[PDB]
From a paper:
The HA RBS is a shallow pocket in the globular HA head, and is framed by four structural elements: 130-loop, 150-loop, 190-helix and 220-loop, named after their positions on the HA primary sequence. Notably, one such antibody, C05, uses a single loop on heavy-chain complementarity-determining region 3 (CDR H3) to target the HA RBS and is able to neutralize several, although not all, strains within pandemic subtypes from both group 1 (H1, H2) and group 2 (H3) influenza viruses. Six consecutive amino acids at the tip of C05 CDR H3 (positions 100a to 100f) directly contact the HA RBS, which is largely conserved across influenza subtypes. The amino-acid sequence of the six residues in CDR H3 in wild-type (WT) C05 that most intimately interact with the RBS is 100aVVSAGW100f.
To provide structural insights, we determined the crystal structure of a C05 Fab variant that was enriched to high frequency in selections both against H1 and H3 HAs in complex with the HA1 subunit of the HA trimer to 1.97 Å resolution. VPGSGW was one of the most enriched variants in the yeast display screening against both H1 and H3 HAs. Two VPGSGW-HA1 complexes were observed in the asymmetric unit. Interestingly, the side chain of S100d exhibited different conformations in the two VPGSGW-HA1 complexes, either facing outward from the six-residue loop (towards the HA RBS, conformation 1), or facing inward within the CDR H3 loop (conformation 2). Although two less intra-loop hydrogen bonds are made when S100d points towards the HA RBS (conformation 1), the Ser hydroxyl takes part in an ion–dipole network with E190 and S228 in the HA RBS. The short bond distances suggest that a sodium ion, instead of a water molecule, mediates the interaction among HA1 S228, HA1 E190, and VPGSGW S100d. Our high-resolution crystal structure also reveals that the main-chain carbonyl of G100c interacts with G225, S227 and E190 via water-mediated hydrogen bonds. The VPGSGW region exhibits a significant local deviation in the backbone conformation from that of WT C05 around P100b, which has no contact with HA1. In fact, V100a, P100b, G100c and S100d form a type II β-turn. In the case of VPGSGW, the binding affinity towards HA that possesses an Asp at residue 190 is much higher than HA with a Glu at residue 190, likely due to more optimal steric packing.
Author numbering:
A (entry chain F): 1 to 213
B (entry chain E): 2 to 27, 27A, 27B, 27C, 27D, 27E, 28 to 52, 52A, ...
C (entry chain A): 43 to 309
Write the structure that this text describes.
Amino acid sequence: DIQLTQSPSSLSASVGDRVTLTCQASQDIRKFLNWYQQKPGKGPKLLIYDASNLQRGVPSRFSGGGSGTDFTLIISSLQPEDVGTYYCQQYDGLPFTFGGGTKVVIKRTVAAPSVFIFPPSDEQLKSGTASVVCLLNNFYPREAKVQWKVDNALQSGNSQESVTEQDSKDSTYSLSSTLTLSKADYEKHKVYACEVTHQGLSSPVTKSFNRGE
Amino acid sequence: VQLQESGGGLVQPGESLRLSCVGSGSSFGESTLSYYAVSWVRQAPGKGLEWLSIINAGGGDIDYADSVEGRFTISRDNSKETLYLQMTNLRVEDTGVYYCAKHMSMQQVPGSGWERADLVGDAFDVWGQGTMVTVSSASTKGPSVFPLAPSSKSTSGGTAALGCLVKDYFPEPVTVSWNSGALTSGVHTFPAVLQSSGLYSLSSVVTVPSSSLGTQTYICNVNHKPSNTKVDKRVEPK
Amino acid sequence: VQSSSTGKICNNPHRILDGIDCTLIDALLGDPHCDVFQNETWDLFVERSKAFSNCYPYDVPDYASLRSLVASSGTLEFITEGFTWTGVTQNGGSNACKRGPGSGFFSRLNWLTKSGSTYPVLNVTMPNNDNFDKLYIWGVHHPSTNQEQTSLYVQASGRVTVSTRRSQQTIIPNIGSRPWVRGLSSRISIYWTIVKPGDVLVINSNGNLIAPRGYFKMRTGKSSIMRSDAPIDTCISECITPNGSIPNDKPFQNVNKITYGACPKYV
Ligand SMILES: *[C@@H]1O[C@H](CO)[C@@H](O)[C@H](O)[C@H]1NC(C)=O
Ligand SMILES: *[C@@H]1O[C@H](CO)[C@@H](O)[C@H](O)[C@H]1NC(C)=O
């Protein structure tokens, strides 16, 4: 089978920067090479067909070149809506194959998260489990540390995080951390705190509640 | 030309499932899907794109990827502008989003008696939204929906956060909207996480003005089609 | 006066070629059920009333003249030439003209269609640098709707011009519905051009060209064609009629006005 290798694996660049993505084929595929953009949880969209043709309706900041084994996709002026994963794809031979993708991220000014904590609902406690949720809203960069504390005991092994994709307009992220406890454990303790560490914060921010208040 | 897949859902290892893709609208000529070759392509959760099968406009020149050859069968009914993928002997690793994708080159003009000699198989210029196929021994389970209530201490002067926790469902996906899709600004619906129980969970949150908390409605509409569950949860302060 | 026949055409001393289910024109164009006639030769081609066409629906303006010309030449010898067709898609086929399991077309013709979103003004040339005349067979496609026209050829109106120094034919496709033939209301029309030694075939088209693949060799000689249902038999007879082979030992005959070979004069 023909293998396509993309470089880099991911990149970040500033709005307006010129960005170069490469694709290398394991053999000569002439110009039977196409580029797609995929935004998270959406279908791919064709950008460039047959190595260098710009698909109708695609902004002219996208261009493609190369032939044989080495291909490039260039974004001449990166825009906030260009975030997503970019795939090359060959049809020189069966099976048709895609590269592994290059993820494109916007590098923007640091933005501290707005933090919010949510106690479990009384309805949920009827299930025998309690979920405590911490929300970090509209921050940059993606890296953040959320620690859970229950009456000042640091929690490990019982939380999970989920992060949005970078917003196509403001280039920020949001993140949830969910702490899962049994009802019995939840009701033994009083102070529930979410402690957030992030580049945009000079010292950690803590949000907390007292159970039942 | 626009494409819409359907038929995806949960099946047990070894079972069969049939996917459909329906073409609607027009392109050059006023061309419909039946002018064109089409492939199925899938994407496993968090992974890249894998080409599966191709079929020419007139039903011929079929080929498959080795991963699915002998198990999957591609076909089409041009009178309904519909493509099919008949899957059999399904395996856990067949799990993923399945897309219908139209190849760009005109391959026939129906009614003209012309067909292109060669199957070009060039760029996929139209893709559908995709249909999720989950191959698992685990059971379907509808979610429970709980409020993420705006706090008593939700001054955060002037902006408040609220949401819905959609817990303990299988398989993916669930969809969430707010106020039947009228509230979109400030909404974040997080990607699903697989819990240690083997069930999924997700939250959706929105930020609103603090002054709006007494005084207009916020309902999260949760839909989990695999279990036919539909909940409209009204979210209010304690 | 020779007044009777055996009712059979003797296969000597003339090379008799039995068309079976094929007209000479279908053998010429290369209708797939006539593939067995490729490069055949004859003294007399025999056309049968069972003959039928089984390819894309077509007509030939001035059919009788092309049939006569080919018949007199006595050969379907075809030489493929290196025509270049830049910016178009070659080898168009049809479910109306199956060859093997798949859609096909007349073997000696090349159905050109658009490439991508464009069909350029084709301008090709083929010099005759040989010492014999070349016969080229070509055509024009008549779509049944404007949507077919623009889907296949881009331009809303095509045109095909084929010329040499001696003459020019300019054919304008006629978009419209003809009577239905096996589910199609479209047609191809067939035309021809002879290119003498030292002359040059020029083809110019911005749509609807059914292109030649090469040329047929032209000879002059004794060959002809006859319509007859008489079976072929293994015997010798110089004189052949549509009713069958007749003895030529008598000076007159009243079997048929149509004869091949050294025959008695008709009455
Ligand atoms: C066709 O070919 C000849 C030789 O290049 C050129 O002089 C002529 O202008 C061309 N005609 C058209 C109609 O393109
Ligand atoms: C030969 O066939 C012709 C044409 O069908 C007919 O007019 C003629 O009478 C026939 N003659 C004999 C002798 O069979």
